[PDB]
Design a protein around this ligand. Sequence first.
Ligand SMILES: NC(=O)c1ccc[n+]([C@@H]2O[C@H](COP(=O)([O-])OP(=O)(O)OC[C@H]3O[C@@H](n4cnc5c(N)ncnc54)[C@H](O)[C@@H]3O)[C@@H](O)[C@H]2O)c1
Ligand SMILES: NC(=O)c1ccc[n+]([C@@H]2O[C@H](COP(=O)([O-])OP(=O)(O)OC[C@H]3O[C@@H](n4cnc5c(N)ncnc54)[C@H](O)[C@@H]3O)[C@@H](O)[C@H]2O)c1
Ligand SMILES: NC(=O)c1ccc[n+]([C@@H]2O[C@H](COP(=O)([O-])OP(=O)(O)OC[C@H]3O[C@@H](n4cnc5c(N)ncnc54)[C@H](O)[C@@H]3O)[C@@H](O)[C@H]2O)c1
Ligand SMILES: NC(=O)c1ccc[n+]([C@@H]2O[C@H](COP(=O)([O-])OP(=O)(O)OC[C@H]3O[C@@H](n4cnc5c(N)ncnc54)[C@H](O)[C@@H]3O)[C@@H](O)[C@H]2O)c1
Ligand SMILES: Cc1cc(C)nc(SCC(=O)/N=c2/[nH]cc(Cc3cccc(C(F)(F)F)c3)s2)n1
Ligand SMILES: Cc1cc(C)nc(SCC(=O)/N=c2/[nH]cc(Cc3cccc(C(F)(F)F)c3)s2)n1
Ligand SMILES: Cc1cc(C)nc(SCC(=O)/N=c2/[nH]cc(Cc3cccc(C(F)(F)F)c3)s2)n1
Ligand SMILES: Cc1cc(C)nc(SCC(=O)/N=c2/[nH]cc(Cc3cccc(C(F)(F)F)c3)s2)n1
Ligand SMILES: [Mg+2]
Ligand SMILES: [Mg+2]
Ligand SMILES: [Mg+2]
Ligand SMILES: [Mg+2]
Lengths: 268, 268, 268, 268
Amino acid sequence: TGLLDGKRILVSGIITDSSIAFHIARVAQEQGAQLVLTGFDRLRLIQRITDRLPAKAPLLELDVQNEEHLASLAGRVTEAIGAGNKLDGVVHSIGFMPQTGMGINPFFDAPYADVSKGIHISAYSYASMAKALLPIMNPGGSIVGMDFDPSRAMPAYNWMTVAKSALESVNRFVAREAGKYGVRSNLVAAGPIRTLAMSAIVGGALGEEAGAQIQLLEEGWDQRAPIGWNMKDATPVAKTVCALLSDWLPATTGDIIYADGGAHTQLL
Amino acid sequence: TGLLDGKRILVSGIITDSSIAFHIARVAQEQGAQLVLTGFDRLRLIQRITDRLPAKAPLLELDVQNEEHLASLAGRVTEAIGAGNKLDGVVHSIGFMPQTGMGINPFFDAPYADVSKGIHISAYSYASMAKALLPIMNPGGSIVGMDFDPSRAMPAYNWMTVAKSALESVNRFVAREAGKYGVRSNLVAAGPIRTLAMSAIVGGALGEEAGAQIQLLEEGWDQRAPIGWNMKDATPVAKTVCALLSDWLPATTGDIIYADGGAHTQLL
Amino acid sequence: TGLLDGKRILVSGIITDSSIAFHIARVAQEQGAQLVLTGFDRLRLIQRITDRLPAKAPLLELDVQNEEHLASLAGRVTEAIGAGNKLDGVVHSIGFMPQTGMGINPFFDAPYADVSKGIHISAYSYASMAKALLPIMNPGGSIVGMDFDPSRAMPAYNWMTVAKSALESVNRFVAREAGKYGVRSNLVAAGPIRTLAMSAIVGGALGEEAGAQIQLLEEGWDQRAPIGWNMKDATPVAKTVCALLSDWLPATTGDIIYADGGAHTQLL
Amino acid sequence: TGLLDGKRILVSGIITDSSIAFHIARVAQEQGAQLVLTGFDRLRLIQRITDRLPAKAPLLELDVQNEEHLASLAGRVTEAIGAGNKLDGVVHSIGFMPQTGMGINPFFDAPYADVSKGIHISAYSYASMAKALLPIMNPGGSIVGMDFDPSRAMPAYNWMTVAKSALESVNRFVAREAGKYGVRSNLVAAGPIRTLAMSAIVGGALGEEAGAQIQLLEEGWDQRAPIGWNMKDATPVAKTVCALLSDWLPATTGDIIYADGGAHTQLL
Ligand SMILES: NC(=O)c1ccc[n+]([C@@H]2O[C@H](COP(=O)([O-])OP(=O)(O)OC[C@H]3O[C@@H](n4cnc5c(N)ncnc54)[C@H](O)[C@@H]3O)[C@@H](O)[C@H]2O)c1
Ligand SMILES: NC(=O)c1ccc[n+]([C@@H]2O[C@H](COP(=O)([O-])OP(=O)(O)OC[C@H]3O[C@@H](n4cnc5c(N)ncnc54)[C@H](O)[C@@H]3O)[C@@H](O)[C@H]2O)c1
Ligand SMILES: NC(=O)c1ccc[n+]([C@@H]2O[C@H](COP(=O)([O-])OP(=O)(O)OC[C@H]3O[C@@H](n4cnc5c(N)ncnc54)[C@H](O)[C@@H]3O)[C@@H](O)[C@H]2O)c1
Ligand SMILES: NC(=O)c1ccc[n+]([C@@H]2O[C@H](COP(=O)([O-])OP(=O)(O)OC[C@H]3O[C@@H](n4cnc5c(N)ncnc54)[C@H](O)[C@@H]3O)[C@@H](O)[C@H]2O)c1
Ligand SMILES: Cc1cc(C)nc(SCC(=O)/N=c2/[nH]cc(Cc3cccc(C(F)(F)F)c3)s2)n1
Ligand SMILES: Cc1cc(C)nc(SCC(=O)/N=c2/[nH]cc(Cc3cccc(C(F)(F)F)c3)s2)n1
Ligand SMILES: Cc1cc(C)nc(SCC(=O)/N=c2/[nH]cc(Cc3cccc(C(F)(F)F)c3)s2)n1
Ligand SMILES: Cc1cc(C)nc(SCC(=O)/N=c2/[nH]cc(Cc3cccc(C(F)(F)F)c3)s2)n1
Ligand SMILES: [Mg+2]
Ligand SMILES: [Mg+2]
Ligand SMILES: [Mg+2]
Ligand SMILES: [Mg+2]
């Protein structure tokens, strides 16, 4: 009697045990979902990481920049879940921007080739994944992507913020197409989560000023959030994604749900 | 094993079996919640209407314009649910604007006394209810109010739209206060629902032009919604309110969840 | 050859030489406009203050809570500017909220009578003034009101923020009506300006915590503004109002122009 | 005694006499500005078109996808305007999306190579142009780009809407950098203008359904605009750009000014 009992849900984006997607997968399994996982490049690592999930799930390779992987994906998923079965949910938890597009590297000095790669992986791939999987999704189904509110500019995040603005726009178009299948498409805009990469950045991996700026941003988030914000805890974010995967938000699509402690609603 | 098993939830705003609050109450009871109901003025009618709910619930009188009713409310609720018990949820489903403030009556011709009454009931009362009930709410609790997206002006709705803009602002402040109790505050912005009053209005009760305009607005909503919009079905709205009353959106506050078919995300 | 050469413009809201309206009036006169001024209650004071403007202008009494003043206003203006002449612009620079609705007085402790008075003066009066003056405005004309961005909640400002949310909604409806006369309606959302009252508040007139909070807010504004923000200088705000009064934004109505240093576009 | 007397302004994006940039250039010259023009690929055509402007202006080649053109641009401009002189304004009026990214070609069927080209030209180039020209701009200067409101999805516009969402984000970051030079950066979001390409599209060049949809969108715009919207008249848009190029919006940056008849403020 979990929130997601009987649902078949694909979860992308696990790379470490600090991945937001790891916690989405854990909570969904706790709530009765049957998962198919996708992973990029380091499949041995990902298998070993996902061995710590509450239940065993098949792992498929998916590089979203690889047209063959995308073209074969629906077939591979159907093989994993069995002929005649379809997916009820899809989680996009994929993002990347080359180091030239973040941190103390000046905003104007990011070459377009690097920005384009970041936008490919972080924004266009949400459309790619919906194209590939909508044909094997059930009516009432749900596609959910991860967002970081890009409505105002911020230090350090630079072109990744631009990629998120593009992702929000992409989501509104995906909703039009997904609606033809009876499927919802939405984003969860999370507050900052202290993943391995975010910890490295705060430690100065992309420069001291950038680290200092991101640290101030994290502190400001908890102070603005009327219920507080714990950047070391992905569970509230994972729960929100599961809410959208469930049957309990059936009239919400093309939209953005903020799992940020309410920080975006307060100026200070 | 309902979504709201064991929760104690107060539900305001039932007047007929077409009330959005009637459906919120029905769905919450289906999901295991224990309700306390509040009603305005016609308590005999409300008792008879609420006899059709899945479970019996106590009904308390609450006129939100009555300072004594508000001052006694927490005590009366505690009497109904038992000393030592607190509420886990509160639903504000209260709205009103005098006829001078809606329809074909020109926008400029609404006297301020009428507008002020509408704003009192529709916006300020969300703060009044939170003031009264926060002292008897548990941490992890949830306050939810009903909204109709007022970001753009519309024909006929006139000062009621202004009242909703004020309610959205009020909600952001209520969240600051509610956060001190570990409690969330949010609004559900619904698409149009064909209540008795909305049917009367479309039938011309506030003028022919106003009726025609609201009818065009309803038609436009279903056409813009990527998953469609059924104005005769309050269930998707009721489910969304229950989602916010549950433990599954624990990092969302001061915010607005759109149960509108995704219509607000599309231009056509 | 000023920006506003030949235009006849009514300017409300002067009370001291720190009033934003004083600077709007000064800049408009510098740019060739012919003014009619309106003042509330302290007409001797206002006359003496406005004697420091670059040119003499008639001063009319207008209490926006007084229905007789509003009913006679168009006639009195026509008397001042001459039969057969109409206004090309109208400036609403009027705001008030009783002390119970701002500062350290708890948000929940403002009586509705006080909030209603604040909303009457700060929001409803924008509609009242447009109703009174549209019949004596020329096509191509412009109505401009003063706003403080209320999209997110803030400390201390409390019910005044709610009143601004209502004013933004009112402006969108006023634009519908004003469009029938060929007239635009817009708001300028200014950053904080150190008027006499704002200085008193920062000095603690509405409590120490409230003062401290507003001071932090002012400091944050200059730090977020990509071009900086000088709270002691109303001239950039006055220039923006004049821009909207001119012929150079002829396709903008129901809208909000931000004269805030760009602060609202940045998170830090 | 024009609005822009004495200002030196670079204007990109003229290709035909229906180009929005043609009208921006004409109005700026009418208001006393000294122009430098940039053109892409068809320089003979552009020279002949710009011969119809009120005053002669030098024309420089600029393909924004060409790193050499961008690297030499400041030098070439300085040659055109004279050593020791700087620019006071810069107009970005550049946009493109391959046909696979617009019209009846399904949203999911646009190859990323095509989308990336569109985003390069339509969004990233706003940053490229600011990088190139900020070093030769005066304090008090102004950078302005053209936008089409992408907050909600629309039929047919597809990936061009995504590119505009990215441009809005890019503008907020450009404002941070431009502020260091005392320079403002803003976008004008215009309603639909019947350029040669828009006429071709409505005539079905990208499919019948797409044409029909864009035609309905244009009609809806005029009906929602409280002051109306004339898609055959670029002058109100050109005036708005000139407003931002002038000294009269000195506290607005990272922002978007809507020259759309107020259509975005109304639902119907
Ligand atoms: N960490 C934060 O503060 C935060 C805040 C809000 C949103 N998000 C978003 O949540 C999502 C998950 O990121 P995370 O913070 O958990 O970091 P992460 O590094 O754990 O997850 C990012 C994932 O993207 C995958 N990826 C990269 N390139 C790929 C490709 N070509 N094909 C397929 N997958 C690829 C990586 O393998 C990795 O699994 C991202 O969209 C991120 O922007 C993160
Ligand atoms: N019907 C719609 O299309 C629609 C769309 C979005 C949101 N809403 C909102 O949903 C909420 C419920 O409205 P509804 O459409 O179900 O209509 P309804 O008439 O069924 O409910 C309105 C309720 O407000 C109560 N009320 C009025 N004055 C009161 C007072 N002084 N004290 C206490 N209660 C009082 C009424 O008794 C009634 O129960 C309202 O906030 C409304 O604005 C309605
Ligand atoms: N000072 C700020 O930081 C700031 C920031 C953004 C916007 N604003 C707004 O600018 C406008 C002007 O305010 P200000 O800061 O210059 O303060 P102010 O006190 O100088 O101006 C407020 C004016 O409102 C007038 N007023 C009050 N009650 C009235 C009534 N019943 N009838 C007619 N007029 C009445 C007062 O007489 C006074 O002239 C207000 O709308 C205010 O909210 C102020
Ligand atoms: N026409 C509309 O309805 C409308 C509405 C809002 C905004 N806009 C925007 O206004 C701007 C001007 O477009 P327009 O409608 O006047 O069409 P247009 O075709 O007249 O102008 C587009 C210009 O972009 C230039 N361009 C394309 N690729 C280039 C490159 N690689 N390098 C340099 N320049 C290049 C073209 O040469 C052309 O001059 C665009 O940003 C457009 O998106 C148009
Ligand atoms: C909002 C947000 C924030 C973050 C940190 N990641 C994400 S998506 C995951 C992502 O982009 N991961 C990256 N890993 C590495 C990137 C670039 C980089 C280059 C060199 C060094 C680092 C370092 F040290 F790991 F931070 C990072 S970007 N989204
Ligand atoms: C967004 C929205 C829309 C509606 C119709 N009601 C609500 S809240 C409920 C509400 O305001 N109820 C009203 N009942 C009566 C009102 C004014 C009125 C006056 C005369 C006649 C009518 C009529 F006929 F019932 F429509 C209505 S307003 N909110
Ligand atoms: C955004 C914003 C901010 C401010 C300060 N005023 C405005 S409109 C002008 C306004 O409301 N003036 C007021 N004057 C007095 C008010 C309440 C008050 C009560 C007691 C003492 C004060 C004090 F000391 F002058 F600040 C103020 S509110 N708008
Ligand atoms: C918002 C908006 C709307 C439009 C029509 N253009 C712009 S920027 C100018 C632009 O993108 N021009 C284009 N010219 C051609 C494009 C693709 C296309 C391909 C084949 C045929 C056409 C046709 F027929 F000229 F419309 C167009 S896209 N921005
Ligand atoms: Mg294990
Ligand atoms: Mg019964
Ligand atoms: Mg004098
Ligand atoms: Mg010639």
